[PDB]
Amino acid sequence: NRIHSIDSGTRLVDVDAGVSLDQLMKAALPHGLWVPVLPGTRQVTVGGAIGCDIHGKNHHSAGSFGNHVRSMELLTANGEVRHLTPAGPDSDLFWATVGGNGLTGIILRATIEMTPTETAYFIADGDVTGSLDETIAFHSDGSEANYTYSSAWFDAISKPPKLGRAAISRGSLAKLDQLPSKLQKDPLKFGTYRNKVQNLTQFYHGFLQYQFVVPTEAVEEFKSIIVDIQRSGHYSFLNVFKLFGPGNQAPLSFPIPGWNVCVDFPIKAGLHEFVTELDRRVLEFGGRLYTAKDSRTTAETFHAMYPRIDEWIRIRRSVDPDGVFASDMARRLQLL
């Protein structure tokens, strides 16, 4: 539950899996290092970050968390401790562990290649659009290459042509060159605008959370989902929009390149019926659902989202035949 080494030269960090990403951030910053993929909470451990293979606002530029793990140590069911690497032997067990939710064993420790930075602040441009078509067109001009971080809040309640209008926030880690004099003293500690310097809390800022992704090319199909959601009467206020980049070698990693949306549906009458249809619609276009604890996602649907599901299940069995690390969700999703 400690951090063993930090090297700015190699950007490598040796850290136990029980260490929270927050604690990792604090320690790594003075060395001019930035955690490659940021957590949603301060209780997210390194092991959780790898097991869930978390993604953030910078996925199009940096991928998910598994992309940055140089090696990890997996305490398996037989009592062994396996040295896992993304490109060496046992790489299959590596990528099955990035995917798996601890169903492969217990991650004890990992080596993580950090992101080099000169400051702890973001420099951001903010834009507002007027409709869903504008929001899409805004992310389709190839301007995503100019910003490492990018996300948008959007209207899912107003009917067209106001549906899909968005407040977009995009930016990158600020250089020392870009900081005001007051902030250059300590650069590495703790809706329309341009060149706005923001710290972590400013930039990165009952219900049923629903997150999915539709392939980039199926844009009209994605628009149709958003339209149908507004029609349904299920109105969410907290809606996040994001365009994902390429995915992993992890067979159970969620992100794929395409349009990613996270809504918070208020628990209403006829929601489970609507969600079931929404699940089918996402899958129909070759999309994928984010499988959380709140799912509410059939095993048939789960196996359909992931083409390499059987390839993963084989690996899980070879490392945990008696299903020691098998949770109730794992059995429910028929992953045994």
mmCIF file of N, CA and C in Angstrom, residues 125-218:
data_model
loop_
_atom_site.group_PDB
_atom_site.id
_atom_site.type_symbol
_atom_site.label_atom_id
_atom_site.label_comp_id
_atom_site.label_asym_id
_atom_site.label_seq_id
_atom_site.Cartn_x
_atom_site.Cartn_y
_atom_site.Cartn_z
ATOM 1 N N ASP A 125 -10.034 25.914 -24.053
ATOM 2 C CA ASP A 125 -10.972 26.659 -24.878
ATOM 3 C C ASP A 125 -12.357 26.084 -24.640
ATOM 4 N N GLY A 126 -13.353 26.956 -24.529
ATOM 5 C CA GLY A 126 -14.723 26.523 -24.323
ATOM 6 C C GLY A 126 -15.637 27.013 -25.427
ATOM 7 N N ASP A 127 -16.531 26.143 -25.880
ATOM 8 C CA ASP A 127 -17.456 26.499 -26.942
ATOM 9 C C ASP A 127 -18.862 25.998 -26.650
ATOM 10 N N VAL A 128 -19.851 26.694 -27.199
ATOM 11 C CA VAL A 128 -21.239 26.278 -27.073
ATOM 12 C C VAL A 128 -21.818 26.059 -28.463
ATOM 13 N N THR A 129 -22.606 25.002 -28.614
ATOM 14 C CA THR A 129 -23.306 24.754 -29.866
ATOM 15 C C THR A 129 -24.810 24.900 -29.670
ATOM 16 N N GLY A 130 -25.555 24.903 -30.772
ATOM 17 C CA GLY A 130 -26.987 25.141 -30.720
ATOM 18 C C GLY A 130 -27.855 23.926 -30.997
ATOM 19 N N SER A 131 -27.246 22.853 -31.493
ATOM 20 C CA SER A 131 -27.998 21.644 -31.817
ATOM 21 C C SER A 131 -27.101 20.421 -31.904
ATOM 22 N N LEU A 132 -27.726 19.247 -31.943
ATOM 23 C CA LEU A 132 -27.007 17.984 -32.034
ATOM 24 C C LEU A 132 -26.121 17.924 -33.276
ATOM 25 N N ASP A 133 -26.641 18.417 -34.396
ATOM 26 C CA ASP A 133 -25.881 18.420 -35.640
ATOM 27 C C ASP A 133 -24.637 19.301 -35.533
ATOM 28 N N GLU A 134 -24.750 20.400 -34.794
ATOM 29 C CA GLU A 134 -23.614 21.291 -34.595
ATOM 30 C C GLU A 134 -22.576 20.646 -33.687
ATOM 31 N N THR A 135 -23.058 19.945 -32.666
ATOM 32 C CA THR A 135 -22.192 19.261 -31.722
ATOM 33 C C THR A 135 -21.355 18.207 -32.440
ATOM 34 N N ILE A 136 -22.014 17.388 -33.256
ATOM 35 C CA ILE A 136 -21.329 16.385 -34.065
ATOM 36 C C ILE A 136 -20.336 17.022 -35.036
ATOM 37 N N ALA A 137 -20.795 18.021 -35.789
ATOM 38 C CA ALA A 137 -19.949 18.700 -36.771
ATOM 39 C C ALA A 137 -18.725 19.317 -36.110
ATOM 40 N N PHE A 138 -18.899 19.742 -34.865
ATOM 41 C CA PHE A 138 -17.826 20.352 -34.098
ATOM 42 C C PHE A 138 -16.730 19.335 -33.758
ATOM 43 N N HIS A 139 -17.112 18.075 -33.558
ATOM 44 C CA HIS A 139 -16.138 17.032 -33.237
ATOM 45 C C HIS A 139 -15.667 16.289 -34.480
ATOM 46 N N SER A 140 -16.087 16.758 -35.649
ATOM 47 C CA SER A 140 -15.811 16.044 -36.889
ATOM 48 C C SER A 140 -14.937 16.839 -37.854
ATOM 49 N N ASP A 141 -14.365 17.938 -37.375
ATOM 50 C CA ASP A 141 -13.515 18.778 -38.214
ATOM 51 C C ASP A 141 -12.037 18.480 -37.982
ATOM 52 N N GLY A 142 -11.767 17.466 -37.165
ATOM 53 C CA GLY A 142 -10.406 17.052 -36.879
ATOM 54 C C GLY A 142 -9.672 17.995 -35.946
ATOM 55 N N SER A 143 -10.424 18.794 -35.197
ATOM 56 C CA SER A 143 -9.833 19.741 -34.255
ATOM 57 C C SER A 143 -9.528 19.060 -32.928
ATOM 58 N N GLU A 144 -9.925 17.797 -32.817
ATOM 59 C CA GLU A 144 -9.674 17.012 -31.615
ATOM 60 C C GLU A 144 -8.186 16.731 -31.434
ATOM 61 N N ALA A 145 -7.413 16.912 -32.499
ATOM 62 C CA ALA A 145 -5.977 16.679 -32.444
ATOM 63 C C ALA A 145 -5.264 17.809 -31.711
ATOM 64 N N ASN A 146 -5.922 18.959 -31.618
ATOM 65 C CA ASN A 146 -5.324 20.142 -31.000
ATOM 66 C C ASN A 146 -5.527 20.195 -29.488
ATOM 67 N N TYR A 147 -6.296 19.247 -28.965
ATOM 68 C CA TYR A 147 -6.590 19.201 -27.541
ATOM 69 C C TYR A 147 -6.436 17.781 -27.029
ATOM 70 N N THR A 148 -5.644 17.607 -25.978
ATOM 71 C CA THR A 148 -5.476 16.284 -25.383
ATOM 72 C C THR A 148 -6.711 15.872 -24.584
ATOM 73 N N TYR A 149 -7.373 16.849 -23.967
ATOM 74 C CA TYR A 149 -8.579 16.595 -23.179
ATOM 75 C C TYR A 149 -9.802 17.249 -23.831
ATOM 76 N N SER A 150 -10.932 16.550 -23.810
ATOM 77 C CA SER A 150 -12.132 17.041 -24.471
ATOM 78 C C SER A 150 -13.383 16.329 -23.968
ATOM 79 N N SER A 151 -14.397 17.108 -23.598
ATOM 80 C CA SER A 151 -15.709 16.560 -23.253
ATOM 81 C C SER A 151 -16.785 17.640 -23.356
ATOM 82 N N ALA A 152 -18.046 17.232 -23.277
ATOM 83 C CA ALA A 152 -19.145 18.174 -23.451
ATOM 84 C C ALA A 152 -20.388 17.771 -22.673
ATOM 85 N N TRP A 153 -21.029 18.752 -22.046
ATOM 86 C CA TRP A 153 -22.359 18.557 -21.485
ATOM 87 C C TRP A 153 -23.349 18.855 -22.595
ATOM 88 N N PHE A 154 -24.438 18.099 -22.675
ATOM 89 C CA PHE A 154 -25.421 18.350 -23.727
ATOM 90 C C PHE A 154 -26.873 18.224 -23.276
ATOM 91 N N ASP A 155 -27.752 18.932 -23.984
ATOM 92 C CA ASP A 155 -29.186 18.932 -23.708
ATOM 93 C C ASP A 155 -29.825 17.669 -24.272
ATOM 94 N N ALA A 156 -30.467 16.894 -23.404
ATOM 95 C CA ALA A 156 -31.157 15.685 -23.833
ATOM 96 C C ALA A 156 -32.661 15.780 -23.566
ATOM 97 N N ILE A 157 -33.120 16.970 -23.190
ATOM 98 C CA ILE A 157 -34.508 17.175 -22.782
ATOM 99 C C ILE A 157 -35.288 18.017 -23.789
ATOM 100 N N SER A 158 -34.684 19.114 -24.234
ATOM 101 C CA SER A 158 -35.294 19.964 -25.246
ATOM 102 C C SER A 158 -35.472 19.187 -26.539
ATOM 103 N N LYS A 159 -36.566 19.461 -27.236
ATOM 104 C CA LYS A 159 -36.847 18.812 -28.507
ATOM 105 C C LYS A 159 -36.056 19.508 -29.610
ATOM 106 N N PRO A 160 -35.903 18.849 -30.775
ATOM 107 C CA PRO A 160 -35.235 19.500 -31.909
ATOM 108 C C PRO A 160 -35.938 20.811 -32.251
ATOM 109 N N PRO A 161 -35.186 21.818 -32.721
ATOM 110 C CA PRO A 161 -33.761 21.727 -33.050
ATOM 111 C C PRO A 161 -32.827 22.056 -31.882
ATOM 112 N N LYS A 162 -33.335 22.076 -30.654
ATOM 113 C CA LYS A 162 -32.491 22.392 -29.505
ATOM 114 C C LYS A 162 -31.869 21.142 -28.880
ATOM 115 N N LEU A 163 -32.367 19.975 -29.272
ATOM 116 C CA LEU A 163 -31.822 18.718 -28.782
ATOM 117 C C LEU A 163 -30.362 18.566 -29.191
ATOM 118 N N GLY A 164 -29.525 18.158 -28.244
ATOM 119 C CA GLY A 164 -28.133 17.857 -28.536
ATOM 120 C C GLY A 164 -27.210 19.059 -28.536
ATOM 121 N N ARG A 165 -27.747 20.234 -28.215
ATOM 122 C CA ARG A 165 -26.910 21.418 -28.047
ATOM 123 C C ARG A 165 -25.993 21.158 -26.866
ATOM 124 N N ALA A 166 -24.800 21.736 -26.896
ATOM 125 C CA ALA A 166 -23.782 21.333 -25.944
ATOM 126 C C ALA A 166 -22.872 22.461 -25.489
ATOM 127 N N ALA A 167 -22.382 22.342 -24.258
ATOM 128 C CA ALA A 167 -21.308 23.191 -23.766
ATOM 129 C C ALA A 167 -20.021 22.372 -23.779
ATOM 130 N N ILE A 168 -19.106 22.734 -24.668
ATOM 131 C CA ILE A 168 -17.911 21.938 -24.903
ATOM 132 C C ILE A 168 -16.680 22.521 -24.222
ATOM 133 N N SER A 169 -15.955 21.667 -23.505
ATOM 134 C CA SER A 169 -14.733 22.077 -22.829
ATOM 135 C C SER A 169 -13.551 21.231 -23.298
ATOM 136 N N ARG A 170 -12.571 21.885 -23.913
ATOM 137 C CA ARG A 170 -11.420 21.192 -24.467
ATOM 138 C C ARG A 170 -10.146 21.894 -24.041
ATOM 139 N N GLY A 171 -9.094 21.118 -23.800
ATOM 140 C CA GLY A 171 -7.835 21.697 -23.383
ATOM 141 C C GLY A 171 -6.704 20.700 -23.250
ATOM 142 N N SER A 172 -5.551 21.212 -22.845
ATOM 143 C CA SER A 172 -4.373 20.391 -22.626
ATOM 144 C C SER A 172 -3.683 20.849 -21.356
ATOM 145 N N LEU A 173 -2.721 20.056 -20.893
ATOM 146 C CA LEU A 173 -1.867 20.459 -19.785
ATOM 147 C C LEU A 173 -1.111 21.712 -20.187
ATOM 148 N N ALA A 174 -1.133 22.714 -19.319
ATOM 149 C CA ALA A 174 -0.457 23.969 -19.606
ATOM 150 C C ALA A 174 1.049 23.807 -19.462
ATOM 151 N N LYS A 175 1.796 24.515 -20.304
ATOM 152 C CA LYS A 175 3.241 24.599 -20.165
ATOM 153 C C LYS A 175 3.552 25.699 -19.163
ATOM 154 N N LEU A 176 4.794 25.741 -18.688
ATOM 155 C CA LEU A 176 5.229 26.809 -17.795
ATOM 156 C C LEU A 176 5.157 28.145 -18.532
ATOM 157 N N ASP A 177 5.379 28.081 -19.841
ATOM 158 C CA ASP A 177 5.306 29.231 -20.731
ATOM 159 C C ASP A 177 3.937 29.909 -20.664
ATOM 160 N N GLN A 178 2.904 29.123 -20.382
ATOM 161 C CA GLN A 178 1.527 29.599 -20.482
ATOM 162 C C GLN A 178 0.911 30.016 -19.148
ATOM 163 N N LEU A 179 1.654 29.845 -18.059
ATOM 164 C CA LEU A 179 1.149 30.212 -16.738
ATOM 165 C C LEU A 179 1.396 31.685 -16.420
ATOM 166 N N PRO A 180 0.462 32.312 -15.686
ATOM 167 C CA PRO A 180 0.685 33.672 -15.186
ATOM 168 C C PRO A 180 1.782 33.671 -14.124
ATOM 169 N N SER A 181 2.347 34.839 -13.834
ATOM 170 C CA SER A 181 3.488 34.945 -12.929
ATOM 171 C C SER A 181 3.216 34.385 -11.534
ATOM 172 N N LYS A 182 1.996 34.584 -11.044
ATOM 173 C CA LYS A 182 1.620 34.118 -9.712
ATOM 174 C C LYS A 182 1.673 32.595 -9.594
ATOM 175 N N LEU A 183 1.367 31.908 -10.688
ATOM 176 C CA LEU A 183 1.290 30.451 -10.679
ATOM 177 C C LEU A 183 2.604 29.780 -11.071
ATOM 178 N N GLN A 184 3.519 30.543 -11.661
ATOM 179 C CA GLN A 184 4.818 29.999 -12.044
ATOM 180 C C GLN A 184 5.706 29.784 -10.818
ATOM 181 N N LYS A 185 5.318 30.404 -9.709
ATOM 182 C CA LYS A 185 6.040 30.257 -8.455
ATOM 183 C C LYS A 185 5.941 28.820 -7.956
ATOM 184 N N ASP A 186 4.761 28.230 -8.105
ATOM 185 C CA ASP A 186 4.528 26.860 -7.665
ATOM 186 C C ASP A 186 3.666 26.111 -8.679
ATOM 187 N N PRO A 187 4.230 25.829 -9.866
ATOM 188 C CA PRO A 187 3.457 25.268 -10.981
ATOM 189 C C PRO A 187 3.054 23.808 -10.788
ATOM 190 N N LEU A 188 3.613 23.143 -9.783
ATOM 191 C CA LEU A 188 3.381 21.714 -9.600
ATOM 192 C C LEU A 188 2.799 21.366 -8.230
ATOM 193 N N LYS A 189 1.700 22.019 -7.865
ATOM 194 C CA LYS A 189 0.992 21.697 -6.626
ATOM 195 C C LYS A 189 -0.518 21.829 -6.789
ATOM 196 N N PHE A 190 -1.231 21.869 -5.667
ATOM 197 C CA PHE A 190 -2.684 22.018 -5.684
ATOM 198 C C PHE A 190 -3.141 23.269 -4.935
ATOM 199 N N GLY A 191 -20.234 30.262 -21.492
ATOM 200 C CA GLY A 191 -19.605 28.984 -21.780
ATOM 201 C C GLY A 191 -18.649 29.061 -22.956
ATOM 202 N N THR A 192 -18.438 30.274 -23.455
ATOM 203 C CA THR A 192 -17.484 30.510 -24.529
ATOM 204 C C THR A 192 -16.261 31.220 -23.966
ATOM 205 N N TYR A 193 -15.087 30.638 -24.179
ATOM 206 C CA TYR A 193 -13.849 31.243 -23.707
ATOM 207 C C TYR A 193 -12.639 30.707 -24.457
ATOM 208 N N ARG A 194 -11.505 31.374 -24.275
ATOM 209 C CA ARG A 194 -10.269 30.980 -24.935
ATOM 210 C C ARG A 194 -9.094 31.090 -23.977
ATOM 211 N N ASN A 195 -8.157 30.150 -24.097
ATOM 212 C CA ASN A 195 -6.899 30.192 -23.355
ATOM 213 C C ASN A 195 -7.081 30.337 -21.846
ATOM 214 N N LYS A 196 -8.112 29.689 -21.320
ATOM 215 C CA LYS A 196 -8.431 29.776 -19.903
ATOM 216 C C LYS A 196 -7.561 28.814 -19.097
ATOM 217 N N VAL A 197 -6.788 29.354 -18.161
ATOM 218 C CA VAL A 197 -5.962 28.528 -17.284
ATOM 219 C C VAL A 197 -6.789 28.036 -16.099
ATOM 220 N N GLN A 198 -6.843 26.718 -15.931
ATOM 221 C CA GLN A 198 -7.654 26.105 -14.887
ATOM 222 C C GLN A 198 -6.871 25.012 -14.174
ATOM 223 N N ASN A 199 -7.101 24.864 -12.874
ATOM 224 C CA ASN A 199 -6.505 23.757 -12.139
ATOM 225 C C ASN A 199 -7.361 22.507 -12.312
ATOM 226 N N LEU A 200 -7.004 21.438 -11.608
ATOM 227 C CA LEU A 200 -7.685 20.154 -11.749
ATOM 228 C C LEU A 200 -9.186 20.241 -11.461
ATOM 229 N N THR A 201 -9.535 20.804 -10.309
ATOM 230 C CA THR A 201 -10.930 20.876 -9.887
ATOM 231 C C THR A 201 -11.776 21.763 -10.800
ATOM 232 N N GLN A 202 -11.153 22.764 -11.413
ATOM 233 C CA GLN A 202 -11.874 23.686 -12.289
ATOM 234 C C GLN A 202 -12.104 23.102 -13.678
ATOM 235 N N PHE A 203 -11.102 22.403 -14.198
ATOM 236 C CA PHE A 203 -11.186 21.841 -15.541
ATOM 237 C C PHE A 203 -11.969 20.534 -15.551
ATOM 238 N N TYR A 204 -11.591 19.631 -14.652
ATOM 239 C CA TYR A 204 -12.198 18.308 -14.578
ATOM 240 C C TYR A 204 -13.488 18.334 -13.762
ATOM 241 N N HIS A 205 -13.823 19.510 -13.236
ATOM 242 C CA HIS A 205 -15.024 19.712 -12.423
ATOM 243 C C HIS A 205 -15.118 18.732 -11.251
ATOM 244 N N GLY A 206 -32.013 6.416 -6.699
ATOM 245 C CA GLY A 206 -32.493 7.697 -7.188
ATOM 246 C C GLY A 206 -32.443 7.804 -8.700
ATOM 247 N N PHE A 207 -31.252 7.619 -9.264
ATOM 248 C CA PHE A 207 -31.061 7.694 -10.710
ATOM 249 C C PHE A 207 -30.505 6.390 -11.266
ATOM 250 N N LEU A 208 -30.506 6.272 -12.589
ATOM 251 C CA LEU A 208 -29.903 5.125 -13.258
ATOM 252 C C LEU A 208 -28.885 5.584 -14.295
ATOM 253 N N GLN A 209 -27.605 5.428 -13.972
ATOM 254 C CA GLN A 209 -26.535 5.820 -14.880
ATOM 255 C C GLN A 209 -26.520 4.925 -16.111
ATOM 256 N N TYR A 210 -26.532 5.549 -17.283
ATOM 257 C CA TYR A 210 -26.510 4.814 -18.538
ATOM 258 C C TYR A 210 -25.427 5.368 -19.455
ATOM 259 N N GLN A 211 -24.447 4.534 -19.775
ATOM 260 C CA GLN A 211 -23.350 4.936 -20.646
ATOM 261 C C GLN A 211 -23.191 3.944 -21.785
ATOM 262 N N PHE A 212 -22.933 4.461 -22.979
ATOM 263 C CA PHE A 212 -22.763 3.617 -24.151
ATOM 264 C C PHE A 212 -21.854 4.294 -25.163
ATOM 265 N N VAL A 213 -21.539 3.575 -26.231
ATOM 266 C CA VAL A 213 -20.740 4.131 -27.310
ATOM 267 C C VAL A 213 -21.203 3.533 -28.631
ATOM 268 N N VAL A 214 -21.299 4.373 -29.656
ATOM 269 C CA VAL A 214 -21.664 3.937 -30.998
ATOM 270 C C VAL A 214 -20.475 4.237 -31.901
ATOM 271 N N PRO A 215 -20.119 3.294 -32.791
ATOM 272 C CA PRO A 215 -19.011 3.478 -33.739
ATOM 273 C C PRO A 215 -19.084 4.806 -34.482
ATOM 274 N N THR A 216 -17.924 5.405 -34.724
ATOM 275 C CA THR A 216 -17.816 6.720 -35.352
ATOM 276 C C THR A 216 -18.598 6.846 -36.661
ATOM 277 N N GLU A 217 -18.564 5.794 -37.472
ATOM 278 C CA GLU A 217 -19.162 5.829 -38.802
ATOM 279 C C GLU A 217 -20.691 5.785 -38.764
ATOM 280 N N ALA A 218 -21.241 5.242 -37.681
ATOM 281 C CA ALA A 218 -22.686 5.140 -37.517
ATOM 282 C C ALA A 218 -23.244 6.385 -36.840
#
